[PDB]
Amino acid sequence: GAMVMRLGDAAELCYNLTSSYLQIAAESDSIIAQTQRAINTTKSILINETFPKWSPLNGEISFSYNGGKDCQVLLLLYLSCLWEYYILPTVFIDHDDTFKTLENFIEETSLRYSLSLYESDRDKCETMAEAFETFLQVFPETKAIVIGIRHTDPFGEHLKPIQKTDANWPDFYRLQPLLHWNLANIWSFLLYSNEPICELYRYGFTSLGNVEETLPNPHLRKDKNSTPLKLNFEWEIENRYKHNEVTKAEPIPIADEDLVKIENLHEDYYPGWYLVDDKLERAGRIKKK
Ligand SMILES: Nc1ncnc2c1ncn2[C@@H]1O[C@H](COP(=O)(O)OP(=O)(O)OP(=O)(O)O)[C@@H](O)[C@H]1O
Numbered sequence: 001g002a003m004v005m006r007l008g009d010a011a012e013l014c015y016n017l018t019s020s021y022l023q024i025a026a027e028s029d030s031i032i033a034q035t036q037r038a039i040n041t042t043k044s045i046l047i048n049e050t051f052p053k054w055s056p057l058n059g060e061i062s063f064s065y066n067g068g069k070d071c072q073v074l075l076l077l078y079l080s081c082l083w084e085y086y087i088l089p090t091v092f093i094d095h096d097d098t099f100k101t102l103e104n105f106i107e108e109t110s111l112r113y114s115l116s117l118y119e120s121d122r123d124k125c126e127t128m129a130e131a132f133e134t135f136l137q138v139f140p141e142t143k144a145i146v147i148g149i150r151h152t153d154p155f156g157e158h159l160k161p162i163q164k165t166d167a168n169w170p171d172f173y174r175l176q177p178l179l180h181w182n183l184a185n186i187w188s189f190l191l192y193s194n195e196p197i198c199e200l201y202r203y204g205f206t207s208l209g210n211v212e213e214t215l216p217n218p219h220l221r222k223d224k225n226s227t228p229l230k231l232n233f234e235w236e237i238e239n240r241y242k243h244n245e246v247t248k249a250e251p252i253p254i255a256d257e258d259l260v261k262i263e264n265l266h267e268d269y270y271p272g273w274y275l276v277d278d279k280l281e282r283a284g285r286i287k288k289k
Helices: 007-022 031-050 069-086 100-112 128-138 183-193 199-203 234-238 256-263
Strands: 061-064 089-092 116-119 144-146 162-164 173-175
Touching: 007 031, 007 069, 007 183, 031 069, 031 173, 031 183, 061 069, 069 183, 100 116, 100 199, 100 256, 183 234, 199 256
Parallel strands: 061 089, 061 144, 089 116, 144 173
Antiparallel strands: 162 173
């Protein structure tokens, strides 16, 4: 059971769930309404500003993919806009310290969505720019790369939806259609989509840095003596997009090695979607000097 979809079927599903999200009846001051607005801006950027300039079909555009929450939301919206526009080269820079659950997830979703995955060499000591230069050598026709970074992410401040790479990178246009999204919008859309998400989030992770530094978020630690946290995504979860027989998905449990690490904490956490404050998204970290 590999939950595999042909690319066209994956695109059509994504178009349907995104359209379905947009049809949710919500109050103007709600998280869902804000998310619908964010989706519209993202669609406009892709359909109106991106696709007419760079062809998503011939290899001009590659999709920067690392299996995280930003990546998956952008992938679902990108697939939606491909279907909308018409009716998948992907690049992951691998590291020696990536969570096994994330590695697994990247592989599983590459299968699920019929992606064409390129991975850099996790055993080569190199910068991201250097890894992308090698990637350019392999795919010299690449003009643009889709990146799901948000303004609230580190180094997210001075970015624009369409922006050339820095001087030390290979020469491409960065396509950054998710900049205006906030953490709450990411969770709301993801939970509603009923698509598989990296299961580390379910255990209290709000970011996925690396195996040595990242911990479940201390703000999400369960304690009899803390005010219990409220869930802002009850509707989305309870009314999540119902899939047909072709498109059915199931979560994939976390890697054995990661469950052992979580169990070793002897502490339980609310899932990551109990966090909606962007300022605390990377709070789950080992104390370093
Ligand atoms: N190692 C990588 N390989 C390919 N793309 C990457 C990589 N790291 C970041 N990116 C790109 O930058 C965007 C930001 O992802 P990042 O993982 O930095 O943010 P996030 O999803 O908010 O955090 P997390 O994954 O820790 O929960 C991603 O959507 C992806 O497009």
